[PDB]
Amino acid sequence: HKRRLSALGPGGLSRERAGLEVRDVHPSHYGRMCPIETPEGPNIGLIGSL
DNA sequence: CGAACCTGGTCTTGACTCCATTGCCGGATTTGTATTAGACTGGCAGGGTTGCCCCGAAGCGGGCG
Numbered sequence A: 001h002k003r004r005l006s007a008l009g010p011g012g013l014s015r016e017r018a019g020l021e022v023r024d025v026h027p028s029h030y031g032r033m034c035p036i037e038t039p040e041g042p043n044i045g046l047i048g049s050l
Numbered sequence B: 001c002g003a004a005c006c007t008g009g010t011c012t013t014g015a016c017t018c019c020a021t022t023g024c025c026g027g028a029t030t031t032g033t034a035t036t037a038g039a040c041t042g043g044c045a046g047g048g049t050t051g052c053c054c055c056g057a058a059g060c061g062g063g064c065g
Helices: none
Strands: A004-006 A047-049
Touching: none
Parallel strands: none
Antiparallel strands: A004 A047
């Protein structure tokens, strides 16, 4: 629950404002953010981990 | 077969107690209203990034009495 990257919050995009393109894995994530671990609900890609 | 009983209540009567229920009556408190004389004179201030769809509004190029 620490080391968690969360792209939603005040100043950040909400889930209804969330497009499909922010939730993908850009190839700059390699070594900076894990492509595997993300919550499988309606938050897939908005919440990650370092 | 009758006498006398004592006991199931049935009901009343009177005397006494207690207790609510207004009734003043005065003080406490509670709520409303008014009044303060130097001068003072035009707001903060924030967010906001989806996408698609339907429709209505404003405008610009096109011709015309």
